[PDB]
Amino acid sequence: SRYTTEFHELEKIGSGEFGSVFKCVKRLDGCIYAIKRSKKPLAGSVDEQNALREVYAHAVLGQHSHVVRYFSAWAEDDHMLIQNEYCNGGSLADAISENYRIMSYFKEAELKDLLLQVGRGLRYIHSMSLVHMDIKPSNIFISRKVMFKIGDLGHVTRISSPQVEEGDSRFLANEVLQENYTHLPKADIFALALTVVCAAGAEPLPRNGDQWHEIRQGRLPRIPQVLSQEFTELLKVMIHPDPERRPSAMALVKHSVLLS
């Protein structure tokens, strides 16, 4: 077994229908990696194309400071294995939950830093003619003095000829629901805005219904933080009903409210 041979398993750090994720030490180099171990999906299935999307996303992307680095992927024992960078801070979702527990919070500055960093990740992905299509707190990872990195590339697809597996409904732009895939990068932008709103301590986002539609009308969820009207206005245009009115990733990262 390659997994057993090359790595020592330390701790399970995730589980779901996707399988399990393990913090592991690679014996050769002594470095820590996050390894996902999944049952190999049925051929030609939803699970397979999603798994495929991730490998071939990696084939294109290479390496960037705001994308979780991919090292290797292989299959054995009717299981799939994906070896990624280990981010010692967990996901943004984990951080948000912990914030709520010990009633801490991300400062307004920290929200802007989060927005800029993931924005840089998106600009790179978009520059490679790809879109993430599943941006949300649980897919943003934290290293350490803090670095935010985009992970979980299972929904990544091409801007040109996309195979769109829709992401979490809570973060999904209406035009994607409407099967309008002519501006998918702006769907990532929509999702990032709501991701920041979650980090800002907004109540849980709706899966559907009235509240759901209200958001897609360009109405921000309620936010207990005292945020500047300017930063607030930036988050609002990011969820504008017209995706062409939303800023591109590159327009986002060179925005005044964010800089520096």
Ligand X SMILES: C=CCn1c(=O)c2cnc(Nc3ccc(N4CCN(C)CC4)c(Cl)c3)nc2n1-c1cccc(C(C)(C)O)n1
Figure out which of the listed residues 7, 124, 141, 181 binds ligand X, where binding follows CB under 6 A: 141
Least CB distance to Cl ion at residue 184 (A): 7
Residue 25 lies near ligand X (rule: CB under 6 A): no
Query: Residue 104: which residues within 8 A CB-CB, separation 6 or more?
Result: 98
Figure out which of the listed residues 119, 121, 167, 185 binds Cl ion, where binding follows CB under 5 A: 185
Query: Residue 255: which residues within 8 A CB-CB, separation 6 or more?
Result: 234, 247
Annotation marks residue 29 as catalytic:
no
Stretch that binds Cl ion, among 130-138, 175-183, 196-204, 226-234 (CB under 5 A): 175-183
Number of residues that bind ligand X (CB under 6 A): 19
Figure out which of the listed residues 94, 108, 113, 166 binds ligand X, where binding follows CB under 6 A: 94
Residue list for the binding site for ATP: 13-21, 36
Cα distance between residue 36 and residue 83, in whole Å: 7
Query: CB-based burial of residue 259 (10 Å sphere; 0-12 exposed, 13-18 middle, 19+ buried)?
Result: exposed
Least CB distance to Cl ion at residue 56 (A): 21
Residue 247 lies near Cl ion (rule: CB under 5 A): no
Q: Which of 161, 30, 142 is nearest to 95 (CA)?
A: 142
Residue 87 lies near ligand X (rule: CB under 6 A): yes
Cis peptide before 260 (omega within 30 of 0): yes
Stretch that binds ligand X, among 50-58, 83-91, 178-186, 208-216 (CB under 6 A): 83-91
- Please compute, for residue 31, the number of CA atoms within 13 A of its CA located in the half-sphere on the CB side: 10
Ranges within 173-232 binding ligand X (CB under 6 A): none
Q: Please state whether beta strands 70-76 and 79-85 pair in parallel, antiparallel, or not at all (unpaired).
A: antiparallel
Decide if 112 contacts 257 (C-beta within 8 A).
Answer: yes
Q: Which of 1, 21, 26 is nearest to 11 (CA)?
A: 21
Cα distance between residue 35 and residue 20, in whole Å: 8
Amino acid letter, 230: E
Q: Would you say 97 or 127 has its CB closer to ligand X? A: 97
Least CB distance to ligand X at residue 192 (A): 17
Residue 122 lies near ligand X (rule: CB under 6 A): no
Residue list for the binding site for Mg(2+): 50, 139, 152, 154
Q: Which residues bind ligand X (CB under 6 A)?
A: 13-14, 16, 18, 21, 34, 36, 68, 82, 84-87, 90-91, 94, 141, 151-152
Catalytic residue numbers read 134
**What are the residues binding Cl ion (CB under 5 A)?**
183, 185
